[PDB]
Structure 1
Amino acid sequence: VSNFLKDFLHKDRDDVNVEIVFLHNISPNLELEALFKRHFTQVEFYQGSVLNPHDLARVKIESADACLILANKYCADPDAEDASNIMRVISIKNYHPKIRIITQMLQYHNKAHLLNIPS
């Protein structure tokens, strides 16, 4: 989150009025809460999985500009983490297919699996 937020809120980038709404089922620790309290006016957090359409309507993903998915690079199974990202893009496209998903994969064949989704 820190490496993402510095690149997203950097002075060199044009001023951004866009807010950032996180969504993660694990409740954050005190240091992540302190990071949110730092970038208070620009970021909000909301606990929940992405595999719940009630959670997606709660974070207003249909009214959201673009969804982003950050993959765990350092994982013990580069296919299982790939699979979790697959299921996340599946759930977001199942709720609202008219949204822009910016995600990150771990191989090249998984790009075809992403292409399998109709939207």
Structure 2
Amino acid sequence: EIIELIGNRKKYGGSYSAVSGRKHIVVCGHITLESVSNFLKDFLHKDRDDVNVEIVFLHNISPNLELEALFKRHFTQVEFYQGSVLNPHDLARVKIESADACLILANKYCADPDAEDASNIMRVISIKNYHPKIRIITQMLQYHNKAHLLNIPSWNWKEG
């Protein structure tokens, strides 16, 4: 019991350090092995022009061994931090003030489409509440839920 009580610690706690002359983005939402692999494979393709933006994930569940191995494979251009996007402390930890954009992934194969949309709406509201000028890209499952995003005070579709 003592051995278990000691060593109960978060290995992914910490804060991102900005680099002068280099952008970065924040990815949150439905983080899993297949989704992350597909997203990275499409984002870091060689057909795109030379890019040097960093990808900073943010999830509240510690990754498993093979996801950690994937992050090790993409060691010098991907970072992971444990936290919740509904927490201003975490949002400040991931240096969201200077982030170029925030991407929110969705769970297409979900049991209830409405709950996922509600959670995504909450995440968008939290991010815009913390910083009302960041650019947000999100996935919506149902059309009648997309009209709710049009009523957020800071959601500008003319901007990206």
TM-score range, shorter chain: over 0.9
Q: Offset at 1:43? A: 0.5
Q: Offset at 1:84? A: 0.7
Larger fraction in strand? 2
Residue 50 of structure 2 is aligned to residue 15 of structure 1? yes
Residue 148 of structure 2 is aligned to residue 110 of structure 1? no
CA distance in 1 between counterparts of 2:71 and 2:100 reads: 21
- Deviation per CA, 1:70-112, whole angstroms, max 9, x where unpaired? 0111111000011111111111011001000011000111121
Partner in structure 1 of residue 26 of structure 2: none
Structure 2: 5+ residue stretches without partners: 1-35, 155-160
- Deviation per CA, 1:12-67, whole angstroms, max 9, x where unpaired? 11121100000000010011111110111111000001000100000011111100
CA distance in 1 between counterparts of 2:50 and 2:149 reads: 32
SS in 1 for 2:82: coil
Structure 1: 5+ residue stretches without partners: none
Q: Which 4+ runs in 1 deviate beyond 3 A?
A: none
TM-score w.r.t. length of structure 1: 0.97
Larger fraction in helix? 1
User: What are the within-5 Å matches in structure 2 for residues 1-119 of structure 1?
Assistant: 1-119=36-154
Identity %: 100
CA distance in 2 between counterparts of 1:40 and 1:31 reads: 14
Q: Offset at 1:11? A: 0.4
CA distance in 1 between counterparts of 2:145 and 2:119 reads: 12
Larger Rg: 2
